[PDB]
Design a protein around this ligand. Structure first.
Ligand SMILES: Cc1cn(-c2cc(NC(=O)c3cc4cc(c3C)C#Cc3cnc5ccc(nn35)C(=O)NCCCCCCCO4)cc(C(F)(F)F)c2)cn1
Length: 291
């Protein structure tokens, strides 16, 4: 049921590689006649590799065209015209959110970003945008299962959008727990009911967002980095919480804990978390200076 848009291979011109995963690589490419205002624009093309993949390929592209929001990474279509199989994405020049945060933690000044550490309003801006994307998926009633900064992209103008890599399992292999197995769980981002009861719901995503929110104010630092995977599981199932980041106001840390209520339905909705963050984000400097 291909209701997903298609792109002729001839309109796609690979320039160079951006990154690589076990199951695929990403290229920067020129895409002609894709958008009307740009006769030529830049896209990020993912090439695959398997009959399991060619069948899997269709499923994700259906999903990707399906969820299109202002804070979900734009998905233009696919090139099924012969092989290799391609997926055409909007190009986000600042890379994933984790790299971006780490590059602007203390300790340069560029086109989109002020010199040195990201400001409180900027840190809040980044968090607000991710929330909105999670608000969208929650309305669509989808669960991300792997919400982390490594799966969020930053675009020119400091635009943050949600994606689901990758890539993530490869470049950030230290962020996953290998179960034998043979799968991998980002245990440091998962709530107690997911580690114990193996349940992943919408209210499991707010827990993930708090950890993402934690990540943002720690400038990309891994949660429970001082702990091993087994030791991390212990702390999480025993109700121990991540300490307040230095760059995090007591007002904002209260939001994290609201996402970290042990019982799934005692947590706040993602609509409610986004609203508090956006207000803080849009808040006048005067209000934030004394925060
Ligand atoms: C089971 C299941 C999963 N999903 C599901 C899958 C996805 N797919 C991806 O997230 C995805 C996947 C991927 C690339 C991109 C993305 C976006 C991009 C990119 C991109 C655009 N500009 C740049 C600039 C630099 C770099 N990358 N980019 C860079 O430095 N890249 C690093 C290169 C790593 C190479 C490995 C290839 C990884 O392959 C999204 C969602 C959802 F819903 F979130 F949108 C859901 C649905 N069902």
């Amino acid at each position: 049921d291909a209701c997903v848009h298609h792109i002729k291979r001839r309109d796609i011109v690979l320039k160079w590689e951006l990154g690589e995963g076990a199951f695929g690589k990403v290229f920067l490419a020129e895409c002609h006649n894709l958008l009307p205002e740009q006769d030529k624009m830049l896209v990020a093309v993912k090439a695959l590799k398997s009959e399991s993949a060619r069948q899997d390929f269709q499923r994700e592209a259906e999903l990707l065209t399906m969820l299109q929001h202002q804070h979900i990474v734009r998905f233009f279509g696919v090139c099924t015209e012969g092989r290799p199989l391609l997926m055409v994405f909007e190009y986000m020049r600042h890379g994933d959110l984790n790299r971006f945060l780490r590059s602007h933690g203390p300790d340069a000044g560029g086109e989109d970003v002020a010199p040195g550490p990201l400001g409180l309003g900027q840190l809040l801006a980044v968090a607000s945008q991710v929330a909105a994307g999670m608000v969208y998926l929650a309305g669509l009633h989808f669960v991300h299962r792997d919400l982390a900064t490594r799966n969020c992209l930053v675009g020119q103008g400091l635009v943050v959008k949600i994606g689901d890599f990758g890539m993530s399992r490869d470049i950030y292999s230290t962020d996953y727990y290998r179960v034998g197995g043979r799968t991998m769980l980002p245990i440091r981002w998962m709530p107690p009911e997911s580690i114990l009861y193996r349940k992943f719901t919408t209210e499991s995503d707010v827990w993930s967002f708090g950890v993402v929110l934690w990540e943002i104010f720690t400038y990309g630092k891994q949660p429970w980095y001082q702990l091993s995977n087994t030791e991390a599981i212990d702390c999480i199932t025993q109700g121990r919480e991540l300490e307040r980041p230095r760059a995090c106001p007591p007002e904002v840390y209260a939001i994290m804990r609201g996402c970290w209520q042990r019982e799934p339905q005692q947590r706040h909705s993602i609509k409610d978390v986004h609203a508090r963050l956006q207000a803080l984000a849009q808040a006048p400097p005067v209000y934030l200076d004394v925060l």
